[PDB]
Design a protein around this ligand. Structure first.
Ligand SMILES: *[C@@H]1O[C@H](CO)[C@@H](O)[C@H](O)[C@H]1NC(C)=O
Ligand SMILES: *[C@@H]1O[C@H](CO)[C@@H](O)[C@H](O)[C@H]1NC(C)=O
Ligand SMILES: *[C@@H]1O[C@H](CO)[C@@H](O)[C@H](O)[C@H]1NC(C)=O
Ligand SMILES: *[C@@H]1O[C@H](CO)[C@@H](O)[C@H](O)[C@H]1NC(C)=O
Length: 147
């Protein structure tokens, strides 16, 4: 059991996603709630200084969120962390309005690029853990979640 074992960050997926459309500005409003698994396999507490995440589409950042003072994670513990990222697809990518409001197809799946960076500090050292994962989202309807 050799320490310091680095924090373990697993990107789960999209728990919920609510969509709104503005006809006149030809924009999609896309609120994505992501779930994050953070595991501490050390026998000492470690604190998660902050989390910064950004939603990307067509190689273009469409949304961003910042979380501060997440929580202290005790020894051998893990925390499930949900964070919501409001995103907007408009202007240069306004063609997505037509596709996402397309009637001839019943489901409208697009691929978003999720980026997240978790900064943890232990014993006066700051470690940084980042991930990039591609994630499916349905931009043609809400994706809800009810326990
Ligand atoms: C999506 O997020 C924006 C900004 O946070 C908010 O104004 C809007 O009401 C949200 N829509 C839904 C359906 O939650
Ligand atoms: C994330 O953590 C929860 C809580 O322990 C667990 O049930 C779930 O399987 C984890 N997700 C993955 C993809 O392992
Ligand atoms: C996150 O926390 C670190 C350490 O406290 C700080 O230096 C940094 O400015 C914060 N924000 C980002 C985006 O790293
Ligand atoms: C579900 O999507 C529709 C699309 O027009 C939107 O009007 C509605 O607000 C969404 N649901 C919620 C709870 O926001």
């Amino acid at each position: 059991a050799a320490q310091p074992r680095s924090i373990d960050v697993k990107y789960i997926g999209v728990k919920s996603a609510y969509v709104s459309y503005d006809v006149q500005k030809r924009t999609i409003y896309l609120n994505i709630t992501n779930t994050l698994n953070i595991t501490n396999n050390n026998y000492y507490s470690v604190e998660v200084e902050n989390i910064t995440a950004q939603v990307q589409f067509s190689k273009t950042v469409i949304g961003k969120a910042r979380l501060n003072n997440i929580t202290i994670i005790g020894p051998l513990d893990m925390k499930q962390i949900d964070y919501t990222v409001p995103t907007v697809i408009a202007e240069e990518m306004s063609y997505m309005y037509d596709f996402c409001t397309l009637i001839s197809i019943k489901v409208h799946n697009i691929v978003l690029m999720m980026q997240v960076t978790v900064t943890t500090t232990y014993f006066g050292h700051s470690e940084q853990i980042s991930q990039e994962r591609y994630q499916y989202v349905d931009c043609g309807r809400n994706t809800t979640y009810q326990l």
